[model samples]
Target: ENIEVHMLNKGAEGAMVFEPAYIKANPGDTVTFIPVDKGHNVESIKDMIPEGAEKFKSKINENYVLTVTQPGAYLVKCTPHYAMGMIALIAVGDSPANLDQIVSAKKPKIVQERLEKVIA
Candidate 1:
């Protein structure tokens, strides 16, 4: 399956965010990150993925495609706009696997708030 995840400067919820901040990806589903606005890149949060999953990141203008195979949550953020709450969550299989770690991971107040909204 192909999923289009958009990186936006602003959208229905707020500024500098990925539209549809949360996603449910099945095994083998490929997610493509489109930079609808400038100065944004797709990056996986450090150590937040399943143990065997490979971490990922993309260039500012690169259309990055990630094939999600592991069964867990993938926390993502835009390096440049992380403080502004440019974050997203991709959950594979049935449910998010690492809720506690993701919740405890240090984040900007605004970023944490945005993440909490989607996680709930």
Candidate 2:
């Protein structure tokens, strides 16, 4: 599946922000995180926060892919922008029914559309 993120003010001073801050995915599905600009990295937040899946980290533009085997929630964030709420949550296996509720409650601005093509 495709996930969209936007570059904004609060995150890393020009770094990208993963819109919605949460996502739902299933086994075999690839959640592609495309940055709106350059110089960004996707990191797992399990080390800092006591929530959801295993702890992991990824390098910038590395196309990190996780094959969902166990069903659970996963918390991820941009390493450079974690303090500014650049975090994203992922729920795997069953789709999160309350995703709309979370989105409505948080009300993060929808900044841009999904990238048409994946960058190398």
Candidate 3:
């Protein structure tokens, strides 16, 4: 299946957000990152990816499509505005295979806070 994630500046009452902040994907599923705003890109957290999975990211003004073959969680962020809480999550294959790892990845404080909001 094809999944779409929007990169927005003013979302859900003026907050920088990713619509559908959390997603459920399956192995081999494709996710397209739609950039609706400048300065936003999908950069996968190094320590937040599943084992044997490569990190994913996009150019500031380019759209990105990813085919996730690993069944795990992906913590995505808008690098330039991560501190502002522009983040998203992708749980591939309905598995919590890397849930503990993602939760203990030691991300930046603000970013971690945002991820926790969804996980918790």
Model 3 residue runs over 4 Å out of place are: none
Write model 3 residue lDDT over 63-93, tens digit each, in one string.
8998889888888888888878888889998
Best by lDDT: 1
* Residue 67 C-alpha lDDT in model 1: 94
C-alpha lDDT score of every prediction, in listed order? 0.88, 0.51, 0.82
Candidate 2 residues lying further than 4 Å off, grouped into runs, are 1-16, 47-54, 95-120
State the lDDT of candidate 2 residue by residue for 7-94, as single tens digits.
3434432335666555666655666666555556677653332234456677765556655444555556777766555666667667
Full-model lDDT, candidate 3: 0.82
Q: What TM-score number comes out for model 3?
A: 0.89
Lowest lDDT 10-mer window, candidate 1?
94-103
Candidate scoring better on lDDT of 1 and 3? 1
TM-score of candidate 1 on Cα atoms, chains taken together: 0.94
- Between candidates 2 and 3, the lDDT winner: 3
Best by TM-score: 1
